[PDB]
Amino acid sequence: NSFEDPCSLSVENEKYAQHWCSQLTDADGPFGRCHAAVKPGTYYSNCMFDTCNCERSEDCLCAALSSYVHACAAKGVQLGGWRDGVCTKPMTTCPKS
Amino acid sequence: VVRASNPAHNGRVCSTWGSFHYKTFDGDVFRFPGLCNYVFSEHCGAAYEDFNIQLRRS
Amino acid sequence: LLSHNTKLTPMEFGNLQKMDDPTDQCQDPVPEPPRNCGICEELLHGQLFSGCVALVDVGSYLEACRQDLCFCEDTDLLSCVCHTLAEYSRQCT
Amino acid sequence: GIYLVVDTDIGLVLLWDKKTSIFINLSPEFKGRVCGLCGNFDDIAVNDFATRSRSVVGDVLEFGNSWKLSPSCPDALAPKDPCTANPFRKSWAQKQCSILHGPTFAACHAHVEPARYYEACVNDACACDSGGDCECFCTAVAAYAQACHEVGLCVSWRTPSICPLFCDYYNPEGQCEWHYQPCGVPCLRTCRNP
Amino acid sequence: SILHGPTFAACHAHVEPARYYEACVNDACACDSGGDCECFCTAVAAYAQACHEVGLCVSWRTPSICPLFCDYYNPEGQCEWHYQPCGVPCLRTCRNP
Amino acid sequence: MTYHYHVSTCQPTCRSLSEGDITCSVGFIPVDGCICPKGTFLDDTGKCVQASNCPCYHRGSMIPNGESVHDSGAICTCTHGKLSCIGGQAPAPVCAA
Amino acid sequence: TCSGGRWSCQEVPCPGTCSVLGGAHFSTFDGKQYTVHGDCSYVLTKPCDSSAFTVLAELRRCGLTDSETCLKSVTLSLDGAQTVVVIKASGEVFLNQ
Ligand SMILES: [Ca+2]
C-alpha cells in the first residue's frame, strides 16, 4: 500500500469528483436525510478516490453513490429521486417492458 | 555549491511543434499524432507536485 | 519507452501519457500505414544553418521536416516547412 | 527526553510533551472500570463513544460535549474545514507533512500506518493560522515518531531545519554530555536509580 | 515584545529597536500564508545581527524562540557544535591554518 | 437474425472467435431457420454483432472494451474487440527449477 | 431506557455486515475499514474450524495502473466445496460449473 492521491494528478478529474461527490456530505442535498443514520465521510472518501482514479469516472461515482444509498436503505432510510443530475443513464437502459 | 559552465542546455528543454513532433528532455524526438488531452509534464518525483502541465490539440 | 523490459513505441508511450476529461471520452489515434512519400536537405545541410550543425544534430529534424512537408495539406511546399526550421533554430539558441 | 513522566503507584503513567500531547498508560487491572473521552477500556472501540449519560451515540460532538466538567460551559460546534477556510496555507501543509510519506519514516510504514497522522498533520498546519505553525507541525510529526518508537523503531527525523532540539543548552560550562536519543535511554544511571 | 523586554535590554542603548519592532509586527501580521515563525525569526534576527555587529552578543534563542539544531551537525559519537552569538571569526580550519 | 433455407455449418460466436474452437457436431443433416447473417457473430446476449463488436475474453472471462488484464507481468488492453498487449506479445514465461 | 437521568442499555441480537465497495474498499463485520488494491482471488469469510461456507472475491487489476481494481466474480462454496456458486460481474451465474 503506497500513499497515492489520484485527485492531485488531474485538475479536471479533481474538479469533477469534488463537484459530484460532495453531495454525499451536503446536509441539504439528495442524501441529507441519511446523515443521522449513516456517516457519509467514508463514502465521500471512496467517491473521491474512485472518481479520481478509475478511467470511467462516472461509473465509479455512481457506484459510490449507489453504495451509500444501499447502506441508507439497509438502515431504513429511503432516498428516492437521488439520480436527478447524475447517474441518469441507468434509469433509461432496461429492456422494453 | 553546484557549478555549471556549459551553455548547451537542450537537456532541460522539451517542446512540441509541427505535425505532432515531440522532443523529450533527454533528446528523444518522436511523432505522436494524438488529438486527446495528454500530460505534457508533471512533477511525479515527490509527494507534493510543484507543477502539472497538460496540452490538448484539435 | 520501457514499461517492464519492453521497448515501447512512440504511439504506446503517447497513449500512456493520456489524461482525459470527465465527460469527454477520447479515442486513441489509429496507427496508419506509411503513405510512401528533398527541400529540407538544401537548407538544413546548407551554410545558412552551418553554425548550428555542430551543436544540434539535424537527422531527427531532417526527418521531422520531411514528415511536415509530406503531411501538410497545401502545396506551399516552400512555405510549409517553416515550423520545423523554427524549432531547429530554437534548439540551436 | 522531551517527555515529562508522571508515575503513580496505582498503575497509571502519563507522558506529557509539555506543549499539547498527553499519553495515558493504564494497567490492565482497570479494564471496564474507566470512562471519559479516552473510552472505557474493554477492547471494543465502537462503544467508546459513550456519553456521560451512559449511552453510546454516533455523533462525536454530542459525546465530547457530554464530558465537559462544567454544565454551564457552552457546547462545542462543528469546526470549519481548515484547508478549505485557509487555502493559502494548504500547499505549505502538504509540503511539510509529506515527511510522513517520504524516506524519513520509510522503515516505520510497515509497523505504524501514517494515514491518520498525515491527515492530522495537514489539518493542524492548515488550522495553525494564529501563530506557531512550527509547533503544530512538530507535535503532529512527533505523534507518529512516538508511535514508531513504541514498537522498537529508532528513527531519527529531527534535522536543524525540521524540529531542532537544543541539547547543547543543557551542557554546563566546558562540558559536552547531552546527546539526542530517538529511542531514549531506558535504564540510565542516576541518583534514584543507582 | 521580545524586542522590548529584558532579552535585549543591553542592546537598547546601542541599537534603536523601533523600526525593527515595527517590521516584526508588520511581518507577523502579513505572514498569513504559512510559516509565520520564519517571519518572526527573521525579524528578530535582523535586530540580533544589528546588536552583534556593534560588540553586544546577546543570547536570545531559546528552545521555544527560534531554536537552532546545532546537535544535527554532531558526528556519530561526537559533541562539538555549539551555539555562538558572537560567532568565532578565527576558529582554526585548514583554509585558515 | 435472418432466415436461411440451408444451414449445414454452425453458428459462429464471439466466444468461438476468442477460444478458436466451437461446440458443434461438424457433420449433421442440414436444417433451416433464422441464423446470424454472413459476416456477423452472435454474442452471449443473443443478438448478431459484427467482428468489431465482439467482446475480448481472457481465461474464459469476458473483458469489456477499454478494460485491461495483467498476466505474467504483461498488461493487455481490450480495444476494438482485440486484446493488444504492451510489448507486442507476452513471451512464454519460464520458471526456474 | 432512561432512569435517574442515566441510560440503562441492554444488548439485543445483531447481525453483522461486511462490504466490498469499488473493488478496493473493505469494511469488516466489526466495522474496521481499509483499502487494498488486490490482484488475485481472496478469502472474504469462512469459519476457521470448518468449511460449511466460504466466500471468495476475485479482485483483479482492470486498468493500466496497479491501483484500479475491479471485482470480477464472487464465489460461494458450501459444505466442503460440494456446492459452488460463481457469480460473475456480467451477471452470469455458474452452479457447480
Ligand atoms: Ca469500549
Side-chain angles (χ1 to χ4, degrees), chain A, chain B, chain C residues 1-40 42-72 74-93, chain D residues 1-172 174-194, chain E residues 1-75 77-97, chain F residues 1-20 22-88 90-97, chain G:
Chain A
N1 248 13
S2 292
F3 323 99
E4 88 204 71
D5 193 14
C7 290
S8 71
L9 301 180
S10 188
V11 183
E12 297 300 325
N13 269 95
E14 177 177 355
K15 287 208 314 254
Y16 180 91
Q18 184 66 236
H19 170 47
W20 286 119
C21 291
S22 62
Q23 307 181 343
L24 291 166
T25 56
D26 189 22
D28 289 13
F31 312 100
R33 277 195 289 110
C34 192
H35 293 194
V38 188
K39 301 186 205 190
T42 311
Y43 295 95
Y44 175 74
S45 297
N46 301 356
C47 195
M48 288 296 292
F49 189 92
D50 290 349
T51 312
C52 288
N53 195 25
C54 73
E55 166 94 10
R56 262 153 323 270
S57 300
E58 215 208 0
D59 276 351
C60 302
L61 158 82
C62 287
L65 299 177
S66 313
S67 71
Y68 186 59
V69 167
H70 190 278
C72 294
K75 280 299 181 180
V77 182
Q78 282 157 249
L79 306 155
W82 67 269
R83 307 187 155 265
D84 318 319
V86 82
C87 306
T88 47
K89 200 257 306 153
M91 262 179 325
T92 79
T93 206
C94 33
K96 312 180 40 56
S97 56
Chain B
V1 189
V2 184
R3 192 135 151 71
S5 56
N6 180 220
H9 56 265
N10 320 93
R12 312 169 19 232
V13 175
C14 87
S15 49
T16 187
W17 76 96
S19 304
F20 314 100
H21 296 277
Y22 293 86
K23 187 204 88 87
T24 73
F25 285 120
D26 299 330
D28 196 18
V29 172
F30 64 92
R31 177 160 188 281
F32 168 54
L35 295 155
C36 300
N37 190 81
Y38 303 97
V39 172
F40 199 49
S41 209
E42 63 159 311
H43 182 209
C44 46
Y48 181 76
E49 300 218 341
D50 286 349
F51 63 97
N52 193 313
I53 301 119
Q54 325 195 344
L55 87 169
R56 199 190 63 202
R57 302 232 198 212
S58 64
Chain C
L1 311 184
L2 311 183
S3 71
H4 297 291
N5 203 29
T6 310
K7 183 63 198 32
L8 287 165
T9 82
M11 263 264 156
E12 291 173 334
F13 167 73
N15 296 321
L16 273 173
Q17 309 308 320
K18 180 150 73 131
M19 179 90 24
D20 265 311
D21 271 345
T23 51
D24 280 32
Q25 330 255 336
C26 207
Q27 326 298 327
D28 268 347
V30 168
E32 275 172 7
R35 37 218 290 147
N36 196 27
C37 57
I39 302 88
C40 320
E42 334 294 332
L43 318 98
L44 282 170
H45 279 132
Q47 189 246 22
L48 190 31
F49 281 100
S50 57
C52 282
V53 186
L55 310 107
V56 189
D57 199 302
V58 215
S60 297
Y61 302 96
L62 240 188
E63 286 136 51
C65 186
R66 299 165 154 139
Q67 291 209 278
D68 289 22
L69 157 79
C70 161
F71 259 106
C72 84
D74 46 15
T75 64
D76 310 30
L77 300 197
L78 204 38
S79 100
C80 216
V81 297
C82 312
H83 295 156
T84 307
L85 290 176
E87 172 68 30
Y88 186 66
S89 168
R90 233 138 37 205
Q91 297 300 325
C92 187
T93 62
Chain D
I2 69 166
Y3 290 102
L4 199 57
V5 193
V6 178
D7 229 314
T8 73
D9 256 34
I10 77 159
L12 178 83
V13 190
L14 272 94
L15 314 173
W16 189 49
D17 90 345
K18 297 182 278 182
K19 295 161 246 262
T20 38
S21 297
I22 199 75
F23 303 92
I24 309 162
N25 285 262
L26 249 200
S27 65
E29 298 123 31
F30 289 105
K31 284 190 71 172
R33 284 137 47 131
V34 288
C35 65
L37 288 191
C38 276
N40 75 312
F41 195 9
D42 66 337
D43 286 358
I44 305 168
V46 289
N47 60 12
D48 273 6
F49 282 172
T51 60
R52 209 191 270 281
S53 302
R54 297 171 184 164
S55 75
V56 172
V57 303
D59 201 24
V60 185
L61 277 178
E62 176 179 354
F63 153 71
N65 280 317
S66 69
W67 282 110
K68 64 197 186 173
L69 283 202
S70 186
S72 60
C73 191
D75 275 0
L77 300 176
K80 321 207 266 287
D81 197 8
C83 295
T84 299
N86 295 329
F88 45 93
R89 325 174 29 93
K90 184 178 185 180
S91 37
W92 177 82
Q94 290 179 333
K95 196 163 183 175
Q96 278 278 81
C97 302
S98 65
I99 178 180
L100 296 167
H101 290 164
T104 308
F105 294 98
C108 188
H109 289 161
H111 308 88
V112 189
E113 256 279 334
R116 53 173 277 250
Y117 296 96
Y118 173 82
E119 292 178 5
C121 182
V122 174
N123 273 349
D124 290 6
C126 273
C128 215
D129 58 343
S130 271
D133 304 64
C134 291
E135 271 217 359
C136 282
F137 165 75
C138 289
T139 296
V141 178
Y144 190 61
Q146 164 74 358
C148 293
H149 296 335
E150 189 103 10
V151 289
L153 279 101
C154 303
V155 47
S156 296
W157 63 279
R158 311 185 168 256
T159 96
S161 299
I162 305 159
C163 305
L165 283 178
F166 212 175
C167 288
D168 185 60
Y169 198 75
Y170 309 118
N171 284 332
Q175 286 298 328
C176 208
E177 311 138 282
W178 291 78
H179 298 101
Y180 166 71
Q181 309 279 355
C183 286
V185 194
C187 28
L188 164 90
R189 168 152 328 150
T190 174
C191 298
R192 305 201 281 201
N193 193 343
Chain E
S1 60
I2 181 174
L3 292 171
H4 281 161
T7 308
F8 294 100
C11 186
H12 285 158
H14 310 260
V15 186
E16 220 149 16
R19 106 188 149 237
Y20 294 95
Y21 171 75
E22 295 173 357
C24 181
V25 180
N26 285 347
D27 289 9
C29 272
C31 212
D32 60 350
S33 270
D36 47 355
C37 292
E38 190 213 297
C39 283
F40 163 77
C41 284
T42 291
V44 175
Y47 187 67
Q49 160 80 331
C51 293
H52 298 150
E53 149 160 44
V54 292
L56 299 117
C57 302
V58 290
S59 276
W60 64 279
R61 311 187 167 254
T62 61
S64 87
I65 302 164
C66 304
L68 278 186
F69 212 174
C70 290
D71 175 276
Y72 202 72
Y73 308 114
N74 285 326
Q78 298 320 303
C79 204
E80 330 165 339
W81 288 78
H82 299 284
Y83 165 77
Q84 311 282 359
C86 270
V88 189
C90 46
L91 87 158
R92 306 193 57 241
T93 172
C94 41
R95 296 208 296 196
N96 179 308
Chain F
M1 268 155 152
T2 301
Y3 186 85
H4 272 68
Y5 275 103
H6 192 250
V7 181
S8 183
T9 57
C10 227
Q11 219 168 233
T13 47
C14 307
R15 188 179 264 110
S16 75
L17 277 181
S18 174
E19 264 79 15
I22 204 161
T23 300
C24 200
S25 168
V26 187
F28 56 86
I29 280 83
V31 303
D32 69 324
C34 294
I35 66 199
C36 281
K38 287 210 46 51
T40 329
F41 305 77
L42 184 82
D43 54 359
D44 321 332
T45 281
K47 81 204 146 303
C48 307
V49 302
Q50 298 268 337
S52 326
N53 298 13
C54 271
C56 320
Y57 286 84
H58 183 254
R59 300 289 179 81
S61 34
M62 164 252 177
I63 302 310
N65 289 292
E67 264 210 7
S68 319
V69 313
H70 297 222
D71 39 351
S72 299
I75 297 169
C76 303
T77 318
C78 170
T79 178
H80 292 320
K82 260 142 280 283
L83 212 81
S84 64
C85 301
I86 282 269
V94 187
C95 323
Chain G
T1 164
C2 173
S3 173
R6 278 150 177 179
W7 287 109
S8 214
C9 299
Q10 328 258 308
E11 328 269 335
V12 306
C14 214
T17 301
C18 192
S19 82
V20 181
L21 310 181
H25 315 287
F26 300 83
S27 178
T28 74
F29 285 118
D30 293 339
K32 186 173 230 332
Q33 280 132 75
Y34 57 104
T35 302
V36 196
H37 296 86
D39 196 13
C40 191
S41 191
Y42 296 91
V43 185
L44 287 184
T45 190
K46 185 196 76 87
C48 315
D49 67 328
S50 157
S51 43
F53 68 92
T54 300
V55 176
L56 307 165
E58 182 184 354
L59 313 147
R60 300 250 170 217
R61 293 163 182 176
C62 51
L64 261 306
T65 63
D66 307 13
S67 67
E68 311 185 9
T69 302
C70 292
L71 178 67
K72 311 256 87 199
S73 79
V74 167
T75 309
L76 168 59
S77 170
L78 293 188
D79 188 44
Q82 289 235 51
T83 295
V84 185
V85 178
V86 182
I87 303 155
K88 310 273 202 105
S90 56
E92 313 194 332
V93 179
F94 300 83
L95 173 66
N96 280 320
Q97 275 142 300

